Amino acid sequence: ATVFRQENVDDYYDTGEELGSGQFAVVKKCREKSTGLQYAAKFIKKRRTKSSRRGVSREDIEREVSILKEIQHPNVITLHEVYENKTDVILILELVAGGELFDFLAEKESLTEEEATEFLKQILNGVYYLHSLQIAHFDLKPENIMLLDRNVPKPRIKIIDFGLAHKIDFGNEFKNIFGTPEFVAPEIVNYEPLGLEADMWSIGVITYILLSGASPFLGDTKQETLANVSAVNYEFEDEYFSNTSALAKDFIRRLLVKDPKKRMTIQDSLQHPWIKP
Ligand code: NA
């Protein structure tokens, strides 16, 4: 998939407001001239020279593009097209316009656990699909859980940002993953082999924040946060978890496990009685 479209994107699309700014990536909304349809345009700066640390290596760009090219599931973002100029690879992606799931839930007046599980189940449906493809996201956190559109009765969740996604064909991959300290699994912290299990840890962190609004492993410095992850230093603070069901804590307890091989699997969690009683 090395040679992308080499036309001027401005010839086929108009681009407007910024939607996100990753490092080495900016996302602008855009409208395809030929169809009227709107999309997100992710501009990934190529490093262009192996010595340059301003940009993303081609290998990383090709990895995200071929993982996106493979997936097609209602709970996962769709890739429409890819362009490449002399500075950027441009990913034309499905426009996800409902904002962050947590933003949306922040505006709810109330949230039972029951309501919370119907949004969480969507996340699990999309991860299940990814893992059935032996694809690990590695960057699962609230910023990458979007709503297609909030103004729908029950909105639909979209998993985004496949910049760390990997096909795990050997049962582990061995490389350093630089994710978000609060959500990466202990094995990412300790530069050990990584698998689908790491996403399961991240899911356990999300569920925690989702039910308490507190971050389980968050410390006063980046290294303390990492030390908390690796030590599995978290507690169900009664200040945040007094009215939280036991079945919910058992769910969380089985995902926040340092030994990945003992961590609950995606299909186990879909069968967990907190998810389907
Ligand atoms: Na579905």
What DSSP string runs through 150-183?
TTSSS--EEE---TT-EE-SSS-B-S-----TTT
- For residue 194, the 8-state DSSP code is B
- Tell me: do 85 and 115 sit in the same domain: no
Residue 21 annotated as binding site: yes
- Tell me: do 75 and 157 sit in the same domain: no
1 inside domain: no
- Tell me: do 234 and 113 sit in the same domain: yes
Residue 124 annotated as binding site: no
- Tell me: do 115 and 76 sit in the same domain: no
Q: Are 44 and 76 in contact (CB under 8 A)?
A: no
- Tell me: do 134 and 169 sit in the same domain: yes
DSSP bridge partners of 135: 167
Method: X-ray
Q: Is 88 a catalytic residue?
A: no
Q: Indicate which CATH number applies to the domain containing 71.
A: 3.30.200.20
Which has the closest alpha carbon to 133: 92, 76, 80, 183?
76
- Tell me: do 108 and 223 sit in the same domain: yes
177 inside domain: yes
Q: Which amino acid is at 261?
A: K
Cα(122) to ligand 1 centroid in Å equals: 7
Resolution (in Å) of the shown entry? 2.5
Tokens for 144, please give them.
């990458």
- Tell me: do 196 and 71 sit in the same domain: no
Cα(24) to ligand 1 centroid in Å equals: 32
Q: Are 245 and 115 in contact (CB under 8 A)?
A: no
Q: Are 160 and 140 in contact (CB under 8 A)?
A: no
Cα(143) to ligand 1 centroid in Å equals: 21
- Tell me: do 128 and 191 sit in the same domain: yes
- Tell me: do 141 and 197 sit in the same domain: yes
**Dist CA 114 CA 93 (whole Å):** 32
Cα(250) to ligand 1 centroid in Å equals: 25
Residues contacting 224, CB < 8 A, separation 6+: none
Residue 27 annotated as binding site: yes
Q: Tally the domains of the chain.
A: 2
Residue 20 annotated as binding site: yes
The full 3-state SS of 129-148, as one line of letters, equals: HHHHCCEECCCCCHHHEEEC
For residue 164, give its domain range: 99-277
Other Cβ atoms less than 10 A from the Cβ of 148: the count is 17
Catalytic annotation, pick one of 139, 238, 259, 268? 139
204 inside domain: yes
- Tell me: do 80 and 162 sit in the same domain: no
Tokens for 71, please give them.
């997936």
Q: Indicate which CATH number applies to the domain containing 258.
A: 1.10.510.10
